[PDB]
């Protein structure tokens, strides 16, 4: 009985592979061959924000391109003012194990999650001038890995129990549960239109979800190991993944297949974070080589290196207007580049 | 050309930095430990006189020194991703049950994996060998045989140089030293010397176990100071 089902599944998988390969006629390399390169660029750290006494795991730029929040192992979640390099808030955390944080697009809420299986939302703008816990969202059977605000009232989470969820804050209970993966889910990235997002798991596969229905639409399997971080192309029809094989890959939503892979022989270490530039021409990355790289998104040529951390780079983010780049590391200093 | 509000915001940031300095200064006084074991090892009952599904916490004091022992029981078998956090802890505590011989190889492989980790090249491990009483009863019964599992036990060198406990069975001493040497061989196979292992034998009912951890953490910190002072 089950043997017939397996045979049918294998036959359909072969059919899908053949159909996907039939649409590959010209590779992106031979199309983008006659393009003037970007040359060489150099970016120097413009500000270095001190105040953390421990490793920095995660960060998220604010929407106004000036404020950002960062989470550390010491148990403090503290918000910076980038231009003057002050501290706006310092939020003591109940659990010292914090692995993700996010800044709401409206700018008056901040989310936090880690090994305690609970996503905690903090209300920043309130009377009596103190940041109190708004809600403690619970219901995940594995450690929270990433969280991203959809709007003021909804937030999407990716947990360490092989599933993602979409919460409603006021009700305080899940309204959708994405359960298609087979391994641990490690990352997540919304889309500019805020109608469909993507996720990354330890089974070396990324899935393109939908927030209305809650059904996986497409799956991309081209990685030889777990993918650690994921972004979204600003056009909204492509994204970039990063695994511990020292290879970033560019996937397309409409073509349903990998387009380019960014690899080099001098690097054999893992990748922790990836992000895109304002025009998407530049694909940033963050490696375990105590430094970062800057990849040309159309030629896969290393067009820059940002070596300023004595420890590994954990988190990376590009400003909404594209004015600056901020990276956090385990040396308790996160520096802004431009 | 500075606004009063910017002056006040800078003063607020200075006060926040002062509070962070004070809190971080206070938080460093205590030492940190990571307790983990495969299964059926009684790792919970290591310390019992002195004493949120994802994380389990335990706080105990000995001679005015605070220890936070962190145990995680809400995770899967594969732990390679949440272990990167525990790289600045003082020492990892490993507990195994030598009573059960059927799953000794699993614990040995687990010790191999934790020893040869890439993020734990600077943490020393404190090894515990739990439930020695049951091992004593099993070996005195004469039912189970070690040659079936470990062919190297049949031909073993007498530990004449090693001093045994005063009054004990030679076969029991041979078996327990063989197990401990099997662990120590994997401990020293790397031969790096950056960090070492601290084996200990533990009874089912043992009143004192925090003193052992204290005397190993003191040795760990002393070795770190010796290394950092250019004396080694």
């Amino acid at each position: 009985e089950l043997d017939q089902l397996r045979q049918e599944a294998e036959q359909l998988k072969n059919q899908i592979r053949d159909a996907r390969k039939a649409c590959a006629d010209a590779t992106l390399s031979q199309i983008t061959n006659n393009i003037d390169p970007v040359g060489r660029i150099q970016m120097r750290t413009r500000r270095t924000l001190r105040g953390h006494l421990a490793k920095i795991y995660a960060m998220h730029w604010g929407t106004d391109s000036r404020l950002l929040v960062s989470a550390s192992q010491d148990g403090k979640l503290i918000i910076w003012d980038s231009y003057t390099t002050n501290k706006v808030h310092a939020i003591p955390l109940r659990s010292s194990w914090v692995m993700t944080c996010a800044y709401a697009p409206s700018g008056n809420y901040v989310a936090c999650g880690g090994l305690d299986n609970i996503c905690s939302i903090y209300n920043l703008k309130t009377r009596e001038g103190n940041v109190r816990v708004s809600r403690e969202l619970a219901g995940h059977t594995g450690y929270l890995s990433c969280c991203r605000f959809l709007d003021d009232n909804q937030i999407v989470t990716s947990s360490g129990d092989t599933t993602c969820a979409l919460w409603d804050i006021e009700t305080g209970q899940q309204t959708t549960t994405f359960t298609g993966h087979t391994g641990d889910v490690m990352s997540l990235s919304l889309a500019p239109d805020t109608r469909l997002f993507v996720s990354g798991a330890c089974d070396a596969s990324a899935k393109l979800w939908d927030v209305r229905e809650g059904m996986c639409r497409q799956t991309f399997t081209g990685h030889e190991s777990d993918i650690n971080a994921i972004c979204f192309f600003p056009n909204g029809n492509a994204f970039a993944t990063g695994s511990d094989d020292a290879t970033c890959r560019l996937f397309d939503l409409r073509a349903d297949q990998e387009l380019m892979t960014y690899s080099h022989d001098n690097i054999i270490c893992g990748i922790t974070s990836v992000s895109f530039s304002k025009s998407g021409r530049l694909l940033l990355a963050g490696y375990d080589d105590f430094n970062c790289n800057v990849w040309d998104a159309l030629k896969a040529d290393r067009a820059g290196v940002l070596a300023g951390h004595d420890n590994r780079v954990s988190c990376l983010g590009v400003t909404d207007d594209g004015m600056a780049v901020a990276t956090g590391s385990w040396d308790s200093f996160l520096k802004i580049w431009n | 050309t500075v606004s009063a509000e910017d002056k006040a915001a800078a003063e607020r940031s200075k006060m926040i930095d002062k509070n962070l300095r004070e809190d971080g200064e206070k938080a460093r006084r205590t030492l940190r430990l990571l307790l983990l074991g495969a299964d059926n090892s009684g790792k919970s009952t290591i310390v019992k006189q002195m004493r949120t599904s994802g994380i389990f916490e335990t706080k105990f004091q000995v001679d005015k020194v605070n220890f936070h022992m962190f145990d995680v029981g809400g995770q899967r078998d594969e732990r390679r991703k949440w272990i990167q956090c525990f790289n600045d802890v003082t020492a990892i505590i490993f507990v195994v049950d030598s009573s059960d011989y059927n799953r000794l190889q699993e614990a040995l492989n687990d010790f191999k994996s934790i020893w040869n980790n890439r993020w734990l090249r600077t943490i020393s491990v404190i090894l515990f060998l739990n439930k020695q009483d049951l091992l004593a009863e099993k070996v005195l019964a004469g039912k189970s045989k070690i040659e079936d599992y470990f062919p190297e036990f049949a031909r073993y060198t007498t530990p004449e140089d090693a001093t045994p406990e005063p009054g004990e069975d030679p076969r029991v001493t041979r078996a327990k030293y063989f197990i401990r040497k099997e662990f120590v061989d994997i401990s020293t196979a790397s031969g790096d010397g950056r960090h070492i292992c601290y084996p200990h034998f533990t009874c089912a009912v043992d009143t004192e176990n925090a003193r052992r951890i204290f005397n190993d953490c003191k040795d760990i910190i002393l070795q770190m100071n010796l290394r950092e002072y250019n004396l080694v």
Partner: single-chain antibody
Amino acid sequence: VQLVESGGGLVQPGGSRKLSCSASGFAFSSFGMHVRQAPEKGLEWVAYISSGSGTIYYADTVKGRFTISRDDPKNTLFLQMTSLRSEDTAMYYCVRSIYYYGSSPFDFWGQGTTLTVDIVMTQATSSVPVTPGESVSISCRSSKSLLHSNGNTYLYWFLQRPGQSPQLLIYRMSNLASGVPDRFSGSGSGTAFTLTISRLEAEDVGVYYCMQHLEYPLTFGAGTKLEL
């Protein structure tokens, strides 16, 4: 969130009196606290005590004889007065303020207790007759430019109903306070500031004060009364 005040009454000239403002309902240690009003004159700044008592400023009129301290555990701040003169009769307001990026200082004011014994800003309007349901505008001039290099214009709008303490309406010339209806709107350029009200209706008649926060001392406007 309340601020109650104690002290006042008849005082002979040259004496001493202590005003205590007790806060109950918010984190008192995180706020910088500040403002008096004569019987028939607009608000006049008096002094300022920072967060954690790390910085103190006074107006020149009250320098050397007014002292401020704050009992953070007691959740209260005081004002010690010595060598009172015949012209210090006023009503003293306990005012809170918190300063960080995106903050809204002067957002709450005390009840006020009667006691009886530099950037120059002018509001040309004194009394403007108005009809209900009619849009109005209130202008407040300045001596020097308030627009800073970073791009923030430090100007505030306060409203006092009859027999009530004033409250924040607009901070930094564009941003609205919390609980203020959207009809209020502030706009202008450097050295020219306007407050525009649309769909004006009842329970909006009072005295409108304009203040600067570019540098100390903080100078208010003369005020503009609205009448039917």
